């Protein structure tokens, strides 16, 4: 158990969207990990009201460390993705009675929201994101202006 070597690495998972595949990988000392390869779905959660749903991810539109990952549509941690917005819209209509915040009510009728990945599906085994709302929504709208 747990020897040491000098200098090497391994090949990344660098997962995509479409044809979700999960490959298990051997971990020394419990917690047998899972590399997600080309995963197309994810668990996405509202921050304020606190409701998750599994949702088809549409695509990552921003990455803060490599712009080429947005071109290749790579799902790492801390990215900006679009998903569906419809089950969160369904819960919103069902349990608030509004049947529609300002800058997310403007995103509802646009159709797709923005969220942040918090798992590491290259190593963990699943993808989760929470829908950005508040000052995170402010700086990421400024990051949309940094896009345009």
């Amino acid at each position: 158990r747990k020897k040491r070597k000098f200098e090497l690495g391994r090949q990344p998972a660098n997962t995509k969207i479409g044809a979700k595949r999960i490959h298990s990988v051997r971990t020394r000392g419990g917690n047998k990990k899972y590399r997600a390869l080309r995963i197309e779905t994810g668990n996405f959660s509202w921050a304020s009201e606190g409701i998750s749903k599994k949702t088809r991810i549409a695509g990552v539109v921003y990455h803060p460390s490599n712009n080429e990952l947005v071109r290749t549509n790579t799902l790492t941690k801390a990215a900006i993705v679009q998903i569906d917005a419809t089950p969160f819209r369904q819960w919103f209509e069902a349990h608030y009675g509004q049947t529609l915040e300002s800058s997310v009510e403007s995103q509802f009728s646009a159709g797709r929201l923005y969220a942040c990945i918090s798992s590491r599906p290259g190593q963990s085994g699943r993808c989760d994101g929470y829908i950005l709302e508040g000052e995170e929504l402010a700086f990421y709208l400024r990051r949309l202006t940094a896009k345009k």
Binding site: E40, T41, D84, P87, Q90, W91
Partner: protein, 297 residues
């Protein structure tokens, strides 16, 4: 019987034997024999019309003998896809009979068979079971995300569970139907579903006032869910025709139901309650009485 079903799988005269078997399958070792006969029959005209309805029942549910076998659902979906856009719906329903990505993709006969196979393969898989909670939440999410779908879901609930005496005024099947009504009202055709749920709650009340703990817990959950359904809906004719005997039996007991009596009394709700009237007894007979008094006043 198993040897003869194996010979029929090894098989004009086969269609005439299929007509006689269509009579026997419209009527009703038997589980493995039914599996072998379904695997044979999935590989006439009016016997075909009746067998399409029987296979739609077997791909919408496995209600009487078993409870939602996945092999039975696969055999019934293969028989329905052999009987009857259509290719894309068939591939999505086949991946659903194989559930997460299929529900994410499928989020009008194809819609009927879709609600059929979805509530079949997640027809109350268990209580918790470390995956049945997620499966029941997935079925509720698909039923809320797919009005014809909810209408067909209430139609299947009423098809599980005469009606004239059930609207005017089998213990184990009634407990199974009460669990079905609790599971149906567990979701986040309205008049027929309310009539069937009121009939189930009234028959549970009668058979409980006459397994007993099963009827007690099912009647309690069904009454709380009925109060929740009336509070989430908010017609007074069938409302009075349902509430009359229930509140009459709960006349002395009311000294769930109290929250319904306090939620159905706060303008048009006040007219709906004064159509019945008791209320001073509900006020006098504790925070559970204090909230009712200092709201109802």
């Amino acid at each position: 019987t198993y040897p003869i079903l194996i010979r029929n799988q090894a098989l004009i005269p086969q269609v005439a034997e299929n007509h006689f078997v269509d009579i026997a399958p419209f009527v009703y070792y038997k589980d493995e024999e039914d599996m072998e006969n379904e695997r044979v029959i999935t590989g006439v005209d009016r016997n075909v019309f009746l067998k399409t309805l029987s296979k739609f029942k077997n791909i919408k549910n496995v209600y009487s003998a078993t409870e939602l076998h996945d092999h039975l659902m696969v055999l019934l979906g293969s028989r329905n896809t052999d009987v009857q856009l259509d290719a894309l719906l068939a591939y999505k329903n086949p991946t659903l009979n194989k559930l997460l990505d299929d529900t994410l993709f499928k989020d009008e006969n194809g819609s009927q068979s879709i609600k059929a196979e979805d509530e079949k393969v997640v027809m109350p898989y268990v209580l918790r079971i470390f995956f049945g909670r997620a499966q029941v939440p997935p079925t509720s999410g698909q039923k809320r995300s797919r009005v014809i779908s909810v209408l067909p879901n209430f139609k299947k609930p009423y098809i599980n569970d005469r009606l004239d005496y059930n609207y005017f005024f089998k213990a184990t099947l009634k407990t199974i139907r009460r669990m079905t009504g609790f599971v149906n009202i567990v979701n986040s055709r309205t008049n027929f579903p309310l009539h069937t749920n009121s009939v189930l709650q009234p028959l549970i009340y009668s058979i409980a006032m006459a397994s007993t703990e099963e009827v007690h817990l099912r009647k309690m959950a069904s009454n709380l869910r009925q109060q929740g359904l009336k509070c989430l809906s908010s017609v007074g004719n069938t409302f009075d025709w349902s509430t009359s005997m229930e509140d009459i039996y709960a006349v002395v007991v009311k000294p769930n139901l109290q929250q319904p009596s306090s939620l159905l009394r706060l303008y048009w709700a006040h007219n709906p309650s004064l159509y019945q009237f008791a209320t001073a007894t509900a006020l006098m007979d504790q925070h559970v009485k204090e909230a009712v008094i200092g709201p109802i006043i």
